[PDB]
């Protein structure tokens, strides 16, 4: 939700506050950065990192997926 | 006070396609939008627009 790009603090370029919207008919709310930790998966090329909103990729890539898939046909 | 806006398209084929040297097509198309916005602001200041008063 809130992004800081201040030059003084090296903490620029990262979201400062977050929308969290779990659901269960309760209001989505706001969390400050300092309280939460985000966990990412496997590294990807930075041009993909930007389009994935700073989020990694699933370990089940399509090469592994169809390698699994053709086994059943076998 | 008024609001301004534009957009650009891009395809995964052209994104994946690489070139010899130079800025990427995405970066150039992003710079085009900024140039268009600045030029439109300058045109509004120096020439006006009759329908928008």
């Amino acid at each position: 939700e809130k992004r800081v790009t201040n030059a003084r603090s090296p903490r620029y370029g990262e979201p400062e506050i977050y929308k969290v919207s779990p659901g269960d008919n309760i209001q989505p709310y706001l969390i400050h950065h300092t309280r939460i930790f985000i966990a990412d998966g496997e590294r990807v090329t930075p041009q993909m990192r930007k389009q994935n909103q700073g989020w990694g990729a699933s370990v089940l890539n399509k090469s592994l997926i169809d390698a699994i898939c053709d086994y059943d046909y076998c | 006070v008024f609001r301004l806006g534009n957009a650009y398209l891009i395809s995964i084929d052209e994104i994946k396609a690489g070139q010899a040297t130079g800025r990427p097509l995405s970066t150039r198309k992003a710079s085009a939008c900024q140039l268009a916005h600045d030029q439109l602001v300058n045109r509004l200041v120096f020439k006006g627009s009759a329908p928008h008063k």
Partner: peptide, 29 residues
């Protein structure tokens, strides 16, 4: 085909392994 090696890297997990096993283990040593 696939002249942009980034697509190859993020597509085939094998090339992923060849490119990332060495340096990451190197630093974690």
């Amino acid at each position: 085909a696939s002249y942009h090696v980034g697509s190859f890297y993020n597509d085939n997990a094998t090339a992923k392994r060849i490119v990332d096993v060495i340096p990451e283990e190197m630093v974690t040593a």
